[PDB]
RNA sequence: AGGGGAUCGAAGAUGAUCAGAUACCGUCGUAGUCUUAACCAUAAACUAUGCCGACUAGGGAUCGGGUGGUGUUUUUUUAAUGACCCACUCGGCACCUUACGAGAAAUCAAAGUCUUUGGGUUCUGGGGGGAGUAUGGUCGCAAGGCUGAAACUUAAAGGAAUUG
């Protein structure tokens, strides 16, 4: 009987994506910050917005959830997004295919190190 | 395809087929039978003089509700009996 | 009415007419 | 309009199959047009087998299970819950479950 | 694929498709040179016998016809000619 | 003012794209009506239909309004738009916006020899939406536009001067005939002629040679 | 042409044998038969790496032809390839889409997740029949990671590979991310392998 | 049965051309279609087509380069007088400048512009464009 | 398209689907043009030169964009043996 | 016309129902249902899709035939041999997705290759009623079948889908 309607949800998703560093786990603490960073006309609503704030923020710290985005996770993901090595596994470190790769080389008139490994007929 | 004889030498079949199928027309059939000439008050005529015999009030086919000011007339040319509308407002007070 | 009983009633009418028509003939 | 791909029947390329009566109203219908139900139930109730085992000189009993094919006309089947009118797009769903 | 070398399809295609729907309606049957230990005459037998076969020199049965290729007799020595 | 959202709008906002035909040369998709506003300032309209159409609901016959508007100057560009809106005047502006979005060119041909400037269509074209089929038959120079009163104005906007329209089906419906005319009129470039057989170097994307200019994240 | 630097060494060929990237499902559509070598006695079909690896080089050439890595969409729709696509975007621009494609992303500019990509990559046409259908409206070249029995409509570059092999889907991503990087620039010659085993693109439970 | 091999030839080409196939196969490979194909061949509408002469009238394969758009037959082969050849073309040709109608003639099998030029007529075989 | 004195009077020369030579429509939003780079020494594709391929939306609809591309690639040396003409 | 004649069952009779119930329900029950020999020649005789021919997309099963496996499977453990599984193919009843294409759509892999209009060929329709009626002929023991209008009358019936 206490389901949170759309407007409290839409307000809550706004604050999480704008001041995620500024939220705190304690409900009373982040209740107060909703005062001057958001315009809530009724005190009861201000409680509820903070109410879903705690629910969302407790979830977000224990792994990011879809529907939430902010700068910190964008850059933190981007830190995984710059994993590029000098070289890579596909290399001349040792074509090992059936006989068709032997016919693959002489087709165009080029020289390749043909080392064929037969595939089962 | 197209369900009609197309072959170069089947002009008769196409002609007889059209001859039979032209009869399903309405204007065509009335001319061939001459039903306007034979079974019709007008013998292929535009007008026909006659004599009014009575003034009849006819209920108007609904949705309209009205008396339709019609007169029974005898056609001189065939002797038949038809009823005729009188145009214009009044015009039954202008006919006897 | 169905196509049946319209046809059936005309069939009964046709039956009646042929007896009457032949009755004079 | 044309409501079904196969008109109402599992009949393709015959012209005639057989008339079959219905187990409720006794209406002659084609056998394939019928609603076929392999009603597989015991003579007794589910909770009933306990007394039979108690009240039999056969300690290891067989639990017989009767078979009867109820051939149903759709007039009786729909009234008898056996089938349900389905969605037009879901009409094509021929899967038994 | 609409771009296919129907002119020279691989040997997989021919043995896969029907004879009459090939490029050239070539027979796939054959005649078999077949011998029996009890005779001294050769005998050429069609793949699908279509009727009983007997050596002229010695009276014998060779392969009883069936719908397709005939099941040859037990003591029958066959070869493709 | 107008802030574009598509790359096409942002690239047009650079001013690099100035040719409408480039959009159609590369078949560039169109999502913003301002694109044709800037590219074709000389662009007029005219409203064909004002049709009331109602949903029968629990309330009753809530009469929505559908109007069809054609757009395109006589230089060889035409766009036909249909839209359903409750307000009568907003339907005109709602319809034209999609009509701008749906602008299509035309291949103007010659009836006979290649004399003078093009006047008519270069081929007889197939068009059929619904039951209506409109067949645009090329006509000699000066023969006039022989068409339905509604359809002929679509051709007048298109800028073709002579054509024969062979209408089929329930031409009484105006929306289908307009679409059928529109389907047929745009089939000119879908029809191949031997002068077109010559291969082209397949000109590269102005979306990439005018290149990334905006959306500089 | 293409240089001699595009061979499949037996060390990574033996990886492909372990990767199980070459054995498909038990049936094949007629548009994937050029990418099939034979069938096995148990009734299963086989992909030949000679086709896909070349075709995978072709796809990179088209991606390399893209000037802006940020306007190329990489699609995943299942955890079987979610980790790889995000971490395929971990090597180039590759504006990614995770799971649900939120249809209306290529038209319908009003949406917040709207994009104007110049190319798309799909892990699975089956799980993503929709976004490929979206390219039909906005003229996007489509490169698909196709099974032998995956329907291949509206897809320009079909990559025949195993979508049922965990070690396969990330490895086809492992390659596809590799040579684009190689053609991106500042990648050294192809003499030596990666820092660690390639097992790192592959989603683990949990 | 095959009431006209020419009809089934032009039918088959259109069916495959609409599909966009690079090659089409025709049977039973008579010469009238072969003569018909020559007329397209000199007009670039059709590409290299290989005639396969099996001992049962054989068959053909036609590597059409996806060039024409619609080639059809006028069956039966109506006769035509030279004064009315233009009348036929208007009803069949998408345009005067391009597209041809094929006339069989005791002179030979040729498209209409040359049949007009050399001034001889006959019966209509088909139309190409 | 050109008049009696050259000077082509035509909005644009349409593209031909290089797979099937059919003329590209003006609204064929399924039709797509792909660019392929040109590679050079030590396996690096160079921006600046690029080969272009046009595909009609009809071909994509039929799902033949892939094989037709292989026909359009085996000739131009992009791939050695991917499109098997004979099978 | 003859034989047969269990069941069911027109007609009919009954007892209920309703206001009426000579209808539905129940019981009885005649012709009939069965057969021998003839008639009639009709059905929503319908897959409401004439017949023949070619082509165009994929798939899967199924029926019948055929082909191959050092495949399984049958007393003998590659022997005196059917069933099965595999790869197929021919023909059939059909089926699932997709609509390239068509269509008014429902839907159709044929209802596709039809305004880019022509493979051959047969029959049928021209708003609805009147009316499959009257007449006339022919067939039939008859029932009736086949052929088949008109006068007169109306501005619409009708198709497929949408919303209520």
UniProtKB/Swiss-Prot annotation, chain A:
Other known facts: Present with 30900 molecules/cell in log phase SD medium.
A GO biological-process term: cytoplasmic translation
Cellular component GO terms, alphabetical: cytosol; cytosolic small ribosomal subunit
Name of this chain's protein: Small ribosomal subunit protein eS17A
Subunit structure comment from the entry: Component of the small ribosomal subunit (SSU). Mature yeast ribosomes consist of a small (40S) and a large (60S) subunit. The 40S small subunit contains 1 molecule of ribosomal RNA (18S rRNA) and 33 different proteins (encoded by 57 genes). The large 60S subunit contains 3 rRNA molecules (25S, 5.8S and 5S rRNA) and 46 different proteins (encoded by 81 genes).
Main location: cytoplasm
Keywords: Cytoplasm, Ribonucleoprotein, Ribosomal protein
Gene3D superfamilies: Ribosomal protein S17e-like
Compartments in which it is found: Cytoplasm
Family of this protein: Belongs to the eukaryotic ribosomal protein eS17 family.
Residue ranges of coiled coil: none
Lineage: Eukaryota, Fungi, Dikarya, Ascomycota, Saccharomycotina
Swiss-Prot record, chain B:
Additional information: Present with 10600 molecules/cell in log phase SD medium.
Cellular component, GO, one term: cytosolic small ribosomal subunit
Similarity-based family: Belongs to the universal ribosomal protein uS12 family.
Taxonomic source organism: Saccharomyces cerevisiae (strain ATCC 204508 / S288c)
GO aspect biological process, one term: translation
Protein name as annotated: Small ribosomal subunit protein uS12A
Sites of the Glycyl lysine isopeptide (Lys-Gly) (interchain with G-Cter in ubiquitin) crosslink: 55
Cellular compartment(s): Cytoplasm
Keywords from the UniProt entry: Cytoplasm, Hydroxylation, Isopeptide bond, Ribonucleoprotein, Ribosomal protein, Ubl conjugation
Its biological purpose: Component of the ribosome, a large ribonucleoprotein complex responsible for the synthesis of proteins in the cell. The small ribosomal subunit (SSU) binds messenger RNAs (mRNAs) and translates the encoded message by selecting cognate aminoacyl-transfer RNA (tRNA) molecules. The large subunit (LSU) contains the ribosomal catalytic site termed the peptidyl transferase center (PTC), which catalyzes the formation of peptide bonds, thereby polymerizing the amino acids delivered by tRNAs into a polypeptide chain.
Subunit architecture: Component of the small ribosomal subunit (SSU). Mature yeast ribosomes consist of a small (40S) and a large (60S) subunit. The 40S small subunit contains 1 molecule of ribosomal RNA (18S rRNA) and 33 different proteins (encoded by 57 genes). The large 60S subunit contains 3 rRNA molecules (25S, 5.8S and 5S rRNA) and 46 different proteins (encoded by 81 genes).
3,4-dihydroxyproline: residues carrying this PTM: 63
Curated annotation (Swiss-Prot), chain C:
Span list, region Disordered: 1-25
Gene Ontology CC annotation, any one: cytosolic large ribosomal subunit
Coiled coil, from the record: none
Pfam families assigned to the protein according to its UniProt record, in alphabetical order: Ribosomal_L41 (PF05162)
Database matches in InterPro entries: Ribosomal_eS32 (IPR007836)
Protein localization: Cytoplasm
The keyword Ribonucleoprotein appears for this protein: yes
Keyword Cytoplasm in record: yes
Gene Ontology MF terms in the entry: structural constituent of ribosome
Additional facts recorded: Present with 11900 molecules/cell in log phase SD medium.
Function: Component of the ribosome, a large ribonucleoprotein complex responsible for the synthesis of proteins in the cell. The small ribosomal subunit (SSU) binds messenger RNAs (mRNAs) and translates the encoded message by selecting cognate aminoacyl-transfer RNA (tRNA) molecules. The large subunit (LSU) contains the ribosomal catalytic site termed the peptidyl transferase center (PTC), which catalyzes the formation of peptide bonds, thereby polymerizing the amino acids delivered by tRNAs into a polypeptide chain.
Subunit structure comment from the entry: Component of the small ribosomal subunit (SSU). Mature yeast ribosomes consist of a small (40S) and a large (60S) subunit. The 40S small subunit contains 1 molecule of ribosomal RNA (18S rRNA) and 33 different proteins (encoded by 57 genes). The large 60S subunit contains 3 rRNA molecules (25S, 5.8S and 5S rRNA) and 46 different proteins (encoded by 81 genes).
Listed name of the protein: Small ribosomal subunit protein eS32A
Protein source organism: Saccharomyces cerevisiae (strain ATCC 204508 / S288c)
From Swiss-Prot, chain G:
N-acetylserine found at: 1
Highest taxon, organism lineage: Eukaryota
Gene ablation phenotype (knockout): Reduction in growth rate, a decrease in free 40S subunits, an increase in the amount of free 60S subunits and a decrease in polysome size.
GO CC annotations, alphabetized: 90S preribosome; cytoplasmic stress granule; cytosol; cytosolic small ribosomal subunit
Molecular functions (GO terms): structural constituent of ribosome
Keywords for this protein: Acetylation, Cytoplasm, Ribonucleoprotein, Ribosomal protein, Ribosome biogenesis, rRNA processing
Subcellular location(s) per record: Cytoplasm
Other comments on record: Present with 93700 molecules/cell in log phase SD medium. There are 2 genes for uS2 in yeast.
Family: Belongs to the universal ribosomal protein uS2 family.
Function: Component of the ribosome, a large ribonucleoprotein complex responsible for the synthesis of proteins in the cell. The small ribosomal subunit (SSU) binds messenger RNAs (mRNAs) and translates the encoded message by selecting cognate aminoacyl-transfer RNA (tRNA) molecules. The large subunit (LSU) contains the ribosomal catalytic site termed the peptidyl transferase center (PTC), which catalyzes the formation of peptide bonds, thereby polymerizing the amino acids delivered by tRNAs into a polypeptide chain.
Name the record gives this protein: Small ribosomal subunit protein uS2A
Lineage of the species this protein comes from: Eukaryota, Fungi, Dikarya, Ascomycota, Saccharomycotina
Portion of the full-length sequence here: 2 to 207 of 252
């Amino acid at each position: 009987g206490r389901v949170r309607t759309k407007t409290v949800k839409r307000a809550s998703k706004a604050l999480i994506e704008r001041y995620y560093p500024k939220l705190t786990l304690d409900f009373q603490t982040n209740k107060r910050l909703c005062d001057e960073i958001a315009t809530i006309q009724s005190k009861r609503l201000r409680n509820k917005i903070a109410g879903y704030t705690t629910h969302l923020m407790k979830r977000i710290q224990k792994g990011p959830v879809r529907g939430i985005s902010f700068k910190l996770q964008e850059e933190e993901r981007e830190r995984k997004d710059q994993y590029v090595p000098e070289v890579s596994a596909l290399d001349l470190s040792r074509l090992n295919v059936d006989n068709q790769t032997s016919d693959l080389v002489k087709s165009l008139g080029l020289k390749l190190p043909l080392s064929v490994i037969n595939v089962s007929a | 395809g197209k369900g009609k004889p197309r072959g170069l030498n089947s002009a008769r079949k196409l002609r007889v087929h059209r001859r039979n199928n032209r009869w399903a027309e309405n204007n065509y059939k009335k001319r061939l039978l001459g039903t306007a000439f034979k079974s019709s008050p007008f013998g292929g005529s535009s007008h026909a003089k006659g004599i009014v015999l009575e003034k009849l009030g006819i209920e108007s086919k609904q949705p309209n509700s009205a008396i339709r000011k019609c007169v029974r007339v005898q056609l001189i040319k065939n002797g038949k009996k038809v009823t005729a509308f009188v145009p214009n407002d009044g015009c039954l007070n202008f006919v006897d | 009415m169905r196509a049946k009983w319209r046809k059936k009633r005309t069939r009964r009418l046709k039956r009646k007419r042929r007896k009457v028509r032949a009755r004079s003939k | 309009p044309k409501k079904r791909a196969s008109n109402g029947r599992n009949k393709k390329g015959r012209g005639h199959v057989k008339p079959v009566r219905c187990v409720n109203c006794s209406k002659s219908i084609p056998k394939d047009k019928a609603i076929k139900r392999m009603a597989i139930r015991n003579i007794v109730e589910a909770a009933a087998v306990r007394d039979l085992s108690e009240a039999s000189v056969y300690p290891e009993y067989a639990l017989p299970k009767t078979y009867n094919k109820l051939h149903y006309c759709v007039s009786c089947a729909i009234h008898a819950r056996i089938v349900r009118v389905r969605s037009r797009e879901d009409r094509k769903n021929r899967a038994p479950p | 694929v609409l771009v296919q070398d129907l002119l020279h399809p691989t040997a997989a295609s021919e043995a896969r498709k029907h004879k009459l729907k090939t490029l050239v309606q070539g027979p796939r049957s054959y005649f078999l040179d077949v011998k029996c230990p009890g005779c001294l005459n050769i005998t050429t037998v069609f793949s699908h016998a279509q009727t009983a076969v007997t050596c002229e020199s010695c009276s014998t049965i060779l392969c009883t016809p069936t719908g397709g290729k005939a099941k040859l007799s037990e003591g029958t020595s066959f070869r493709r000619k | 003012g107008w802030v574009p959202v598509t790359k096409l709008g942002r690239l047009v906002k650079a001013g690099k794209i100035t040719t409408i035909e480039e959009i159609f040369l590369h078949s560039l998709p169109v999502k913003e009506f301002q694109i044709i506003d800037t590219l074709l300032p000389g662009l007029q309209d005219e409203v064909m239909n004002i049709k009331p159409v109602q949903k029968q609901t629990r309330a009753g016959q809530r009469t929505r309004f559908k109007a069809v508007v054609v757009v395109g100057d006589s230089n060889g560009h035409v766009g036909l738009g249909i839209k359903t809106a409750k307000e009568v005047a907003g339907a005109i502006r709602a319809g034209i916006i999609i009509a701008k979005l749906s602008v299509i060119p035309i291949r103007r041909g010659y009836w006979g020899t290649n004399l003078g400037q093009p006047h008519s269509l270069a081929t007889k074209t197939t068009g059929k939406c619904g039951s209506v089929t409109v067949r645009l038959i090329p006509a000699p120079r000066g023969s006039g536009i022989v068409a339905s009163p509604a359809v002929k104005k679509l051709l007048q906007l298109a800028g073709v001067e002579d054509v024969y329209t062979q209408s089929n089906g329930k031409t009484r419906t105006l929306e289908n005939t307009l679409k059928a005319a529109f389907v047929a009129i745009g089939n000119t470039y879908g029809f191949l002629t031997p002068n077109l057989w010559a291969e082209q170097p397949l000109p590269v994307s102005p979306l990439d040679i005018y290149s990334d200019e905006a959306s500089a994240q | 042409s293409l240089p001699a630097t595009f061979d499949l060494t037996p060390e990574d060929a033996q990886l492909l044998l372990a990767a199980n990237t070459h054995l498909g499902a038990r049936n094949v559509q007629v548009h994937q038969e050029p990418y099939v070598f034979n069938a096995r006695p148990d009734g299963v079909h086989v992909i030949n790496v000679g086709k896909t690896w070349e075709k995978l080089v072709l796809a990179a050439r088209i991606i390399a032809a893209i000037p802006n890595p940020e306007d190329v969409v990489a699609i995943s729709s299942r955890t079987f390839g979610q980790r790889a696509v995000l971490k395929f975007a971990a090597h180039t621009g590759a504006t990614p889409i995770a799971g649900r494609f939120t249809p209306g992303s290529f038209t319908n500019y009003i949406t917040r997740s709207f994009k104007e990509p110049r190319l798309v990559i799909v892990t699975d046409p089956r799980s993503d029949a929709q976004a490929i259908k979206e390219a039909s409206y906005v003229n996007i070249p489509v490169i698909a990671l196709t099974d032998l029995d995956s329907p291949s409509e509206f897809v320009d570059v079909a990559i025949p590979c195993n979508n049922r092999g965990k070690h396969s889907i990330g490895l086809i991503w492992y390659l596809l991310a590799r040579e684009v990087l190689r053609l991106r620039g500042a990648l050294v010659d192809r003499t030596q392998p990666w820092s660690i085993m390639p097992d790192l693109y592959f989603y683990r439970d949990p | 049965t095959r009431s006209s091999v020419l009809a089934d030839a032009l039918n088959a080409i259109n069916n495959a051309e609409k599909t966009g196939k690079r090659q089409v196969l025709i049977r039973p490979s008579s010469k009238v279609i072969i003569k018909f194909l020559q007329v397209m061949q000199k007009h670039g509408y059709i590409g290299e087509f290989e005639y396969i002469d099996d001992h049962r009238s054989g068959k053909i394969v036609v590597q059409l380069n996806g060039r024409l758009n619609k080639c059809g037959v006028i069956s039966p082969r109506f006769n035509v007088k030279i004064g009315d050849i233009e009348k036929w073309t208007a009803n069949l040709l998408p345009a005067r400048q391009f597209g041809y109608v094929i006339l069989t003639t005791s002179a030979g099998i040729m498209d209409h512009e040359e049949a007009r030029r050399k001034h001889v007529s006959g019966k209509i075989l088909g139309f190409v464009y | 398209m050109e008049n009696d004195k050259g000077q082509l009077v035509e909005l644009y020369v349409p593209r031909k689907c290089s797979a099937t030579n059919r003329i590209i429509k003006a609204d064929d939003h399924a039709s797509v043009q792909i660019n392929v780079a040109k590679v050079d020494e030590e396996g690096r594709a160079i921006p600046g030169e690029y080969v272009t391929y046009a595909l009609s939306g009809y071909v994509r609809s039929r799902g033949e964009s892939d094989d037709s591309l292989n026909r359009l690639a085996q000739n131009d040396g992009l791939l050695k043996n991917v499109w098997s003409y004979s099978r």
